[PDB]
Amino acid sequence: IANQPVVIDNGSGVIKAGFAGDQIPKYCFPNYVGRPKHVRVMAGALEGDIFIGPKAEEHRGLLSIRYPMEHGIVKDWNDMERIWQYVYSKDQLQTFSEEHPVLLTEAPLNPRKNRERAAEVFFETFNVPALFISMQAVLSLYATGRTTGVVLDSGDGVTHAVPIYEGFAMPHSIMRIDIAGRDVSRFLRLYLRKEGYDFHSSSEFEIVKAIKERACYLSINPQKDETLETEKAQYYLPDGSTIEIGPSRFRAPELLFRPDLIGEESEGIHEVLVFAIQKSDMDLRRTLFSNIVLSGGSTLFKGFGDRLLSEVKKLAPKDVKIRISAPQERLYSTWIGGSILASLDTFKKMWVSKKEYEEDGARSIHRKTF
Amino acid sequence: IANQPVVIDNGSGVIKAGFAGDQIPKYCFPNYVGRPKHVRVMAGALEGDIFIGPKAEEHRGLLSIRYPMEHGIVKDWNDMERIWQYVYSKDQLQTFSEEHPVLLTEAPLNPRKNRERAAEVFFETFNVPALFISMQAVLSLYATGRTTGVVLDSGDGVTHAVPIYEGFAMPHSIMRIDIAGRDVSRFLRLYLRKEGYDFHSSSEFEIVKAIKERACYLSINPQKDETLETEKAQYYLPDGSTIEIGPSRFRAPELLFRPDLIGEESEGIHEVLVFAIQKSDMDLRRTLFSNIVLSGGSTLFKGFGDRLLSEVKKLAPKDVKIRISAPQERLYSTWIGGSILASLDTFKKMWVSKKEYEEDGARSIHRKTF
Amino acid sequence: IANQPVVIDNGSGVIKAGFAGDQIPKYCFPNYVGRPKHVRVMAGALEGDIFIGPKAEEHRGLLSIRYPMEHGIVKDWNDMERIWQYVYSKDQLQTFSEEHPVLLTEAPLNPRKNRERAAEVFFETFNVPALFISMQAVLSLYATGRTTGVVLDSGDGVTHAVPIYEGFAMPHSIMRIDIAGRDVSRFLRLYLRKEGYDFHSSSEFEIVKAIKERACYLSINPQKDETLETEKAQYYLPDGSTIEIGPSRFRAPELLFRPDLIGEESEGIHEVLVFAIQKSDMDLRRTLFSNIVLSGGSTLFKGFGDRLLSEVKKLAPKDVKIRISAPQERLYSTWIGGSILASLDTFKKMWVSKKEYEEDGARSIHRKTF
Amino acid sequence: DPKYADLPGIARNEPDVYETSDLPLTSTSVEHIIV
């Protein structure tokens, strides 16, 4: 029976999971995989060697945590099933795959081997009878209510500026250059290497990401604020020590708009989005110039969208209505948008049923996902 | 075997002995290895010619007392055999090696050769079916109930903090050090010569050890209490001969924190503990700050842990709440914890079947002693 | 002012010295920073009582040796101060920085305060007319005559491959790794305590490293040769003490590719080299397959390059011709390539005048190093 | 605690726990306009 469907947002840095109808995915944790470091000899430790959530956050430097979804490329399939199982566990779902429908998420340009591989999971290992998987940008559109908007997500290593029109993302205009703050924080670790600090452990790097999400912003003036002398704000170490910040809090995110700092032939999100704009109807661009759909977790900086506004001003001509539509519960905005989509009743068709998967599998999906 | 499992309290200075389930180690005695310094030409004297027990613990200068555990590392083997024969003495055991499960404890990073010697003993001379050789700080964790903790042992020539976390194998993080009150008391014999006290015997050294265990402590203020002058309280010999104590009572144990008084470069093991802290991780460091264990006989001094508290306060950064835990039964903590582990069903898999283990060589439990 | 240019090999493992045009580094000595372990009372000891040079090179166990170059990064600048004072010793040079063009080298990615601090010394205490702090793999490019190439380096606690092409700005593809023989020999001290060899001093560590450089080979098969039966080569100490080895002689350099032995999370510098290959491009990759350079004094091993070549083959792609050019004197070759560059007079652009350093310093460093 | 009274390696006046002291913005629609 089509029970309460589960909206599972597979965000790059943080995966989200919760039943539809709800407003908060009660079962969330970041997108990682945590295996231990040492060998517990005495008891009093946990068992399973795959510790997620409070165990992971608890045993941070005790676990040699890793990350499966690498710019939308996940490879820990079996452990992914165990992650879902961790959600399927008494901790988070307490239910079965067969019992409740599943609303899973996606990103563009994904290899159908991996997509159908996930279908093998939820139809063979797990046995979801009502599983539908789709983009997260449309979910953000449900949240904003806008239908003709250019959605760009901001995760940890995923940034796809997708221009959508009335719920129809033009594939010829869809832009997917999934790379974000992952290497920015890695380059900040390089700053720390140029400061004498290594964060080669993921948990060691998790603290870097915590301060990254915490003590960082977007200095709208790039070289002006870059050439000025920073103050090197002493930020507390988690043990109780304290270390400076420097330009890094704004100097490292300059790489987002200036990909050449890492040495990458890219153009900066704004220009990529302008390229997406170029591949459309001229009149619709003016709407999209004002239909600035912000999304993703990395859209949490001071002067973030305003520096982006300056980028647009350097890109868009005069008498162009520019209008940022920033959300607030960004990653959950897509999750709640999925709660809206999963609540639909016409929605029962294109989801691959279990028998539908038994029919062809691959082409049944190909035709039902397209 | 379905009998009471023997818990060897292989103490460095004081090597006690006992079983499992009991809360008192059966017999307590040190590393004394006596043999008479004279010849009983007169018939009617006492036999043995090797003395372990009240025979030596009653007459000392008559016997050439020896100590082979060179900082725990025993060099005698034949004498150890006889000691273990004495372990099966009439007052001591009147049992068999075959008749009882036996559990051995060891310091970390000991030579495999010693374990080979033990295998020769308990597998050729003795024939323990259920013989396992283990560590020593894990025992203290059993007694304290903790799983996470900095266990500082206190032997006669062996002291080192053991930072544990749920039995996790952290040999690089965990630090072993073999030095304690042996040469401190011998250094006090140097003080004796600098104060006119012609003493050269190990028995005399034991009397000094009675002062060590009795009239000695750790002055939290090093030179503030060292540069002053005490009244030199008087100690009485076995005859009752009055001998002043002096400032030495706190001056000599400062070598434990100031190893360069003997000239050997070291830190004062609390700083080695800080090195272990460095090897650990920031918030996990805080757990171990809150989790410090003090075992071993040499921990017993006035302001001992308090002086070390002040040391780390002069070492650890601000807002660093540290907590120690010094059980009254320091040496017994290891013994009772060994009783705890020896009283376990899982513990049956720790050792290897006796005869096959002999055929397995030693590398098998060498790999299984972790 | 164009006198003979000083060739300052900034040898972390072994520092070297001399001028340009000299086909052999005149002065060569390691990171040792000593002053007596004991205290002399009667005259007869040498004068200065902080000794570096022949006095230290003849009195190991007498001077308290220390090292400021934590991973080749000096922290005690005071040590370098006295070292540079010793640079003009009556045995050494007896000249002025003012009297000479000076050239410095640097392993990349060091914190800016290091070379800034050094330049402060050489332009404040010392007063160099024109100087520059070059890199270190270019030296090897001169020694090979190549322009395209992967250059491995080896100090004492620093080892990394440097993929180059005609001196081009490829810092992302270019790597840096700070780990080498320092802790490998410290791990050898660990082996010593593992089997009862009582060794803990720095001079004792020097002896250990001498035998390490002497009695340590590299078996090509890792576990196939690691699980064999060892002969335990009885090394007779320089004093004459017979000391066996075990498989430890080749086990310790495996840590350089098996960082998990010490518990470090790394890959093996060859894998990082493969990552650099990935960071390069298919056409340029083949060049690097053909162009590999091993340098640094720590690279000196028995069965060294053959094993590492085999490991690369284990990780190399389909039949791509792996080729490693090699300098016979990896220690010399560096200083000599620096001697070449110092004797290269195109350095006019590449130097930094004193006045310029006074005006900018850091800006002059970056703008002249980029 | 008789077991904690019997053996001699059980000292007293021990406050075992030696310690230290203890003396203790998501925005929406950040738009613009250009006309």
Ligand SMILES: Nc1ncnc2c1ncn2[C@@H]1O[C@H](COP(=O)(O)OP(=O)(O)O)[C@@H](O)[C@H]1O
């Ligand atoms: N305050 C913040 N600053 C920077 N990045 C953030 C912040 N909050 C979340 N993120 C980024 O978003 C990631 C999680 O978002 P994710 O669900 O991956 O978004 P998306 O669905 O856009 O990929 C985190 O790993 C982090 O990198």
Ligand SMILES: Nc1ncnc2c1ncn2[C@@H]1O[C@H](COP(=O)(O)OP(=O)(O)O)[C@@H](O)[C@H]1O
């Ligand atoms: N009251 C005391 N004060 C100080 N030291 C003591 C006291 N009682 C016993 N000891 C010490 O205990 C040590 C005996 O070594 P032991 O603790 O048996 O080794 P291990 O720690 O390996 O068991 C000796 O240093 C002895 O001085």
Ligand SMILES: Nc1ncnc2c1ncn2[C@@H]1O[C@H](COP(=O)(O)OP(=O)(O)O)[C@@H](O)[C@H]1O
């Ligand atoms: N046979 C050997 N095995 C290992 N290390 C060696 C050997 N011979 C010399 N060394 C090492 O030479 C190193 C010197 O490195 P060097 O070439 O001076 O690099 P750097 O210039 O970066 O210090 C020292 O670290 C010392 O350990």
